[PDB]
């Protein structure tokens, strides 16, 4: 791949915590420690709107499947469901007793999953805003939560060193260095997990075996988003504490590109759903989002 910087997105006044493309590929949403959500054009980076209401910084944001809603996780111990068109807060999800770190819709987007520093995973009903289940998931802050492709499964990770798979319908656990990020692969059969020994590993969870290991980057202090890039060549994409975006060949485990430009830890990366486009975001010495594009 030949990812090249195309746009730098300026607006946040503190660290950018997460960037996520909308499923229709039209928009990029960003969350920040400055308590704001900002929406940008996915292809040109043009600022669109600021969405405000959280009383403390935001660690994560995520899109509903139809690209109409957002959910945000905030240090004010709540999540908020937003109507992106109107910018209005539809619901405020209360129940966590500490910072909410991570969040996601299920594919049907009738549920929300959240991970918190209170060490629980919570499952929320989008329509009523009610908390349906509270899982005593870990013995340390929860670093990531993600649904599989039909929402029947939740994968969570934690600084306690564990990665666990949960049955959404019952809340019960199906399967078990700090684990700082996890997410299901696009086909649903693998789990990409990051640990704070500068390592990413691809796990076949049905077999419970580690298939591939990716090294080269620096990840010892922060929880960093990683991604499967599938629009062109099959890559693993992740941020790094050396201010670079790393891209690995999924199959060969070779580093094939390092995207240079950010001036602080690259804490978030995201891959566009149909075009060879990467978005990346950095901590408070940088505060900008960058859009990178590749011919393949
Ligand atoms: C999750 O538990 C722990 C956390 C930490 C500190 N610490 N470590 N990483 C991040 C942070 C906080 C800062 C941050 C981080 C990570 C992200 C990226 N981000 C957000 C949601 N999900 C992800 C991968 C964003 C930010 C915000 C400044 C913008 C220390 C101990 C434990 C435990 N026990």
Numbering used by the authors: 33 to 208, 215 to 334
What does the paper say about this structure?
Genetic and pharmacological evidence suggests that the nuclear scaffolding protein WD-repeat containing protein 5 (WDR5) is a therapeutic vulnerability of the CSC population. Previously reported WDR5 WIN-site inhibitors contain a tri-substituted amide core with an Arg-mimicking “S2” group, which penetrates to the bottom of the WD40-domain central cavity, and two additional “S4” and “S7” substituents that make interactions with pockets along the surface of WDR5 (chemical structures in **[Fig fig1]**, binding pose in **[Fig fig1]**). Herein, we report the structure-guided development of a novel series of triazole-based WDR5 WIN-site inhibitors designed to increase passive brain penetration. Herein, we describe a small series of WDR5 inhibitors containing a tricyclic triazole as a core amide isostere. These triazole-based inhibitors potently inhibit WDR5, maintain a conserved binding mode in the WIN-site, exhibit passive permeability, and, in some cases, improve brain penetration.
We prepared analogs with two distinct S4 groups: a low molecular weight cyclopropyl (**C3TD343**, K_i_ = 5.9 nM) and an elaborated trifluoromethyl pyrazole (**C3TD078**, K_i_ = 0.030 nM, **[Fig fig1]**). The triazole analogs **C3TD343** and **C3TD078** were found to have favorable permeability (MDCK P_app_ > 2) and measurable free fraction of ∼2%. Encouragingly, however, the triazole **C3TD343** was readily brain penetrant and displayed an order of magnitude higher rate of permeation than **C16** (K_in_ > 50 x 10^-^ mL/s/g, **[Fig fig2]**). We proceeded with a dose-escalation experiment of **C3TD343** in mice, which revealed a dose-proportional increase in brain exposure after IP administration using 10, 30, and 100 mg/kg (**[Fig fig2]**). At 100 mg/kg, **C3TD343** achieved a total brain C_max_ = 2.4 μM and AUC = 2.9 μM*hrs, yielding a moderate P:B = 0.25. In agreement with the *in vitro* CL_int_ values (**Table 1**), **C3TD343** was rapidly cleared from circulation, leading to less than four hours of brain exposure. Representative data for a potent compound (**C3TD078**, K_d_ = 2 nM) and a weak compound (**C3TD343**, K_d_ = 200 nM) are provided in **[Fig fig4]**. On exemplar triazole, **C3TD343**, showed robust passive BBB permeability, but it was not efficacious in an intracranial xenograft due to a combination of low potency, rapid hepatic clearance, and Pgp- mediated export. The S4-truncated **C3TD343** does indeed cross the BBB, but like the other reportedly brain penetrant analog **HBI-2375**, it is too weak (K_i_ = 5 nM) to have pronounced functional effects in cells: a similar 2,700-fold shift would imply an unfeasible transcriptional IC_50_ > 13 µM, well above the brain exposures achievable with **C3TD343** (C_max_ = 2.4 µM at 100 mg/kg).
